Design a protein around this ligand. Structure first.
Ligand SMILES: O=C(CCCC[C@@H]1CCSS1)NCCOc1ccc(CC2=[SH]C(=O)NC2=O)cc1
Length: 257
């Protein structure tokens, strides 16, 4: 019955709000000049990057490690979200590990789009904002943000809100095509449910948006290509800069094939 799927949707949106401090709703309010939320300081160049301290080593390296620390933070937020998905903590621990390993970046880049417009990305819980052009002007680092921006601009076109994203993020984790899974069937059973709940939510929440469900599912291939591209680019950056750390959490997630 649809009735159960609605309760599942409401549960998931609720733990999404509890798990992620910076929702798309707050991000969009910050980004469009709304009075619910303050203004960001904008980092468009190096001097603005320095002023960003009075009110919120090399530069491309600091920025990149910042993306790492934020990711390490998001992995925690995503992991707490995962535990709220009905059934997830009942799975074999190794499969729990495998689902997070492969799902976490796909989720990070989905939710990063929430913080993006054509021109840039919120940073530091929305206090600041750093232009897409500044990030494109950084030789090995100058291109690392561009595919995320490209996907975010297409993804934001779906006009999804947080209650839709909560379910879709859950669908991403509960994949079951992930490499190395022990018991695929109990994972697929959870996802069948999540897919029905997502399908119903999009239908109720976006009634004049034909086949939004299919188009959202199609954006999953883009996410996979962002991740696999970023892994290749991550290899390059680590060899050209032998002095750049990678957090051990991200290192473990980025298992060579
Ligand atoms: O840019 C910002 C914040 C800048 C930080 C502040 C600055 C400190 C000093 S100055 S400001 N947020 C959006 C950036 O988009 C990304 C891209 C990748 C990731 C996760 C990564 S990166 C990697 O190699 N592996 C990963 O899992 C996270 C965010």
């Amino acid at each position: 019955e649809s009735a159960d799927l609605r309760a599942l949707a409401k549960h998931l949106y609720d733990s999404y709000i509890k798990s992620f401090p910076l929702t798309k709703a707050k991000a969009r309010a910050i980004l469009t000049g709304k009075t619910t939320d303050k203004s960001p300081f904008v980092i468009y160049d190096m001097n603005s990057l320095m002023m960003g301290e009075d009110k919120i080593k090399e530069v491309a390296i600091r920025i990149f490690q910042g993306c790492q620390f934020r990711s390490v933070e998001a992995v925690q937020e995503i992991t707490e979200y995962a535990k709220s998905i009905p059934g997830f903590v009942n799975l074999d621990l190794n499969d729990q590990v495998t689902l997070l390993k492969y799902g976490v970046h796909e989720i990070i880049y989905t939710m990063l789009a929430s913080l993006m417009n054509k021109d840039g990305v919120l940073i530091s819980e929305g206090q600041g904002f750093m232009t897409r052009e500044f990030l494109k002007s950084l030789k090995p680092f100058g291109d690392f943000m561009e595919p995320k921006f490209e996907f975010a601009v297409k993804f934001n076109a779906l006009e999804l809100d947080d209650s839709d994203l909560a379910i879709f993020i859950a669908v991403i984790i509960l994949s079951g095509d992930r490499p190395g899974l022990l018991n695929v069937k109990p994972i697929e059973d959870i996802q069948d449910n999540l897919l029905q709940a997502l399908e119903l939510q999009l239908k109720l929440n976006h009634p004049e948006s034909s086949q939004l469900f299919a188009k959202l599912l199609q954006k999953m291939t883009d996410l996979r290509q962002i991740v696999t591209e970023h892994v290749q680019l991550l290899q390059v950056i680590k060899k050209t800069e032998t002095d750049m750390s990678l957090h051990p959490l991200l290192q473990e997630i980025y298992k060579d094939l």
